[PDB]
Design a protein around this ligand. Structure first.
Ligand code: 9IY
Ligand code: 9IY
Lengths: 465, 465
């Protein structure tokens, strides 16, 4: 099915011919180059298990590569020899060593996160070949990081307005399934979000977690019964009340989310929920609340006006922090216009009008799982060290016009500092042992995963202070 | 392997219970809602063939869904009955009809592009079950569209500065493989780019084309031998000239791209290429030119200073439009900081300094295939028509705070206007036959692809004026 020989930037096919003659080692590292001051390291284990481990080279896959690349370049540039070596010598197991910080670890920017080097001098070319597939770890890293930053904002404001962080892990739902570029992207994105939260509408995210990480948590992911516009609008413009009444009665004993902005969000909250069907809401259990979903207008203005309306029609309490609280059978979900920037504006506006964050949970789609790029955290793979004619050489780029594109020199290691911070030691200075043990661990060697983490370990490592 | 029962927004599991009783039909449409004034319709055929066609329901997949959703909701909310019906009645073939504009069609914004309706009254729920997976067509649509807009800019400036569009389809390369969220996303993205251009470093893009569309073109995709920083830097800081000389000699008879900004782009062009190795460049064939790749600094400023340096060291001609032309053995690739916005700035700045666009080709990665979202063209799926108690009802949303989120009413059709423009007719007004035949065709019915397009047809349909 998958052919790792095809799974590279096609130009890398020619790179074995381009390295200095008598090169026995190519050593390369991945970092989130130097606001996202710290990144969550998550997703490498998925790639290692799915694509890189075991017998990944066959006679068929070498022949497929030869044909595919011959057409692509209109020239017989693909080299079977190096792949035939790996097939014959190691039964198609990749002779590379990958070291990495533990999955879920929170590491400041500008630090070595993983390194790759060949274990056989004949496979010097292989380190660079697998750059492309390993670099795609930027996505689960960037989703996990951006999601965790949104969790920080929710943590600050939930603690301020309620005095606790009860239910924090249910405050930001993944609605991104339709808004991402592929089914595979949806799975990886959902799992990266689930490092921080439990809410997703992509069950493939939980399947990815169970298969590639594993969990002792009986409920690692969840969702709630919810309406869409179609299940309201299908009743006709004049029968919105009938749609509401049908759905809350059909889901009387469980939580139900009901989109209320089909025609007039403010009419729906004040006249339909707040008057006509009030008796069907106030009778509902604390375990089975109505969640009103606005989905249009200015996100903050809409939330404030909805809470104002519900406050006028339902009994509002004031909690011990002096913040207004809706009854336990009634809540709101803001599933429109939420990203890292707007989330901050919304909880701040809610705090200024003395509404507890426990009143409103949040959802994000494209902004959560799609509107992220490799440049967000500057995720890149760079050659730092080579052995040529048996002599180690510390290598790096340093473009005269952009110092930010300078890469690190030589053999790298990651260390805790005395004050509890992080330092990446260059030029093999880790060997001086002036800091503790290297924080990177061998996770991959000669086609085998040597060190693995449960999703429980990932979540624990990725926790907030 | 893939389970379409799991491949929905998890809340849609409950929607069969939410539609009005006695609903026999759910009819829904996809549009790029109302700068991208026109969109390329591409990628639906990939989804229909990969995920939706044939026996997609089994006893095992129904049992998997029951278990997966029971945990996800902590409640037995998944309905086996509807799926057991489809299994027993249609041998697991989906009883839906999908109509769509031809693949590669260029359609203005705010027009019906495809429609979905159930063909069996028992499967009214199925239309909106498959929303999530069909909506993911936003990505190949948005990539194809954004790529075509970049082609328009290159077309304008290439014609202006050269007098022809020779090699236009090779002017923008896909470097996006590492910069996208998954391997599947890389394939789909590359194929969407290849609607407009032939340059990609993702061979999976060509494999997707051949398998899901097919082509009579012997060379639908291509790439060129190229260096990366690693194959230059590995030689050591003092041996940049040696790396250059080795690579151009190893690729003497083919085109070779050589990244030249490792240490000092301007030193490399003036002193290394322009003096030390000049004799190895000026001897090269028109079919095997050196391509210098800057990869840092202000994109426009760097390009202009590079061309100025090469102009001072190599013979420059002036073409019949009065624009400066490098010798046929020497060209430039700007593979850094290129997107729809900057591409315009670069070719404009090149034109103002009287440099032909023939001199410089372009490459884009994340900006091409990753930094795109569903909201770019406002791609959405909406229920427009239902039959309840045997009576047709025209349905729509109309949120009071956002008129732009208003959806279309009733049975839809797409028509050419007398002046050669497009109109979407609502409320079944297509039946009046004032505007000739509906442009949408049945592409899917009862688990079978009924209408298919070659990638040759897609490319022809997606052509510039
Ligand atoms: O309401 C739902 N899903 C439905 C849904 C459907 C669609 C959307 C939005 O609409 C967009 C789709 O529209 P277009 O296609 O773009 O036109 C989508 O991208 C997203 O932005 C949002 C939500 N889920 C849900 C989940 C958890 C909560 S809770 O955390 O409050 C809570 C948890 C547990 C117990 C009590 C409370 C509340 C609600
Ligand atoms: O030069 C190459 N590929 C190599 C390459 C490698 C990397 C890059 C850039 O670097 C990024 C990766 O770096 P980081 O990981 O972010 O640090 C990547 O995203 C991209 O931005 C760009 C290019 N190919 C190539 C293709 C076609 C032309 S042509 O159209 O001029 C032409 C066509 C036909 C005959 C003659 C001429 C010229 C050159």
């Amino acid at each position: 099915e998958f052919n790792i020989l095809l799974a590279t930037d096609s130009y890398k096919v020619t790179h074995y011919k381009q390295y200095p003659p008598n090169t026995s080692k190519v050593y390369s590292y991945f970092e989130c180059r130097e606001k996202y001051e710290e990144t969550v390291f998550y997703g490498l284990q998925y790639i290692l298990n799915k694509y890189l481990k075991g017998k990944v080279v066959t006679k068929e896959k070498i022949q497929e590569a030869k044909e595919v690349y011959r057409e692509h370049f209109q020239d017989d540039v693909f080299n079977e020899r190096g792949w035939n070596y790996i097939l014959e010598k190691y039964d198609g197991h990749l002779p590379i060593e990958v070291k990495a910080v533990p999955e879920g670890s929170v590491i400041p920017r500008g630090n070595v996160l993983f390194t790759v080097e060949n274990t056989d001098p004949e496979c010097y070319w292989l380190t660079n070949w697998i750059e492309t597939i390993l670099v795609q770890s930027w996505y689960p890293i960037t989703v996990a990081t951006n999601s965790r930053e949104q969790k920080k904002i929710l943590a600050k404001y939930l603690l301020e307005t309620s005095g606790n962080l009860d239910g924090l892990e249910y405050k930001l739902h993944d609605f991104g399934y339709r808004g991402v570029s592929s089914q595979e992207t949806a799975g990886i994105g959902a799992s990266a979000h689930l490092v921080n939260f439990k809410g997703t509408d992509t069950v493939a995210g939980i399947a990815l977690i169970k298969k590639y990480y594993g969990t002792k948590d009986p409920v690692p992911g969840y969702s709630v019964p919810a309406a869409e516009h179609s299940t309201i609008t299908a009743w006709g413009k004049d029968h919105e009340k009938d749609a509401f009444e049908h759905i809350v009665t059909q889901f009387s004993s469980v939580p139900v989310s009901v989109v209320s902005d089909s025609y007039d969000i403010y009419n729906a909250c004040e006249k339909i929920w707040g008057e006509d069907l009030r008796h069907l809401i106030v009778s509902r259990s604390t375990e089975a609340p109505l969640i009103i979903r606005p989905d249009s207008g200015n996100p903050l203005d809409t939330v404030l006006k909805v809470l104002d309306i519900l406050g006028k029609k339902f009994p509002v309490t004031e909690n011990s922090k002096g913040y207004k609280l809706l009854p336990p059978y009634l809540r709101v979900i803001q599933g429109d216009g939420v990203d890292i920037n707007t989330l901050q504006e919304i909880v701040e506006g809610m705090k200024q009008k003395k509404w507890s964050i426990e009143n409103v949970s949040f959802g994000s789609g494209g902004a959560l799982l799609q509107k992220l790029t490799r440049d967000l955290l500057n995720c890149s793979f760079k050659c730092s060290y080579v052995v040529t004619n048996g002599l180690g050489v510390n290598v790096f780029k340093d473009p005269v016009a952009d110092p930010n594109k300078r890469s690190k020199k030589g053999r790298l290691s990651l260390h805790r500092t005395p004050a509890g911070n992080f330092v990446t030691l260059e030029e093999g200075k880790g060997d001086l042992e002036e800091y503790g043990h290297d924080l990177l661990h061998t996770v991959f060697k000669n086609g085998k995963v040597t060190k693995s983490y449960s999703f429980d370990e990932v979540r624990k490592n990725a926790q907030l202070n």
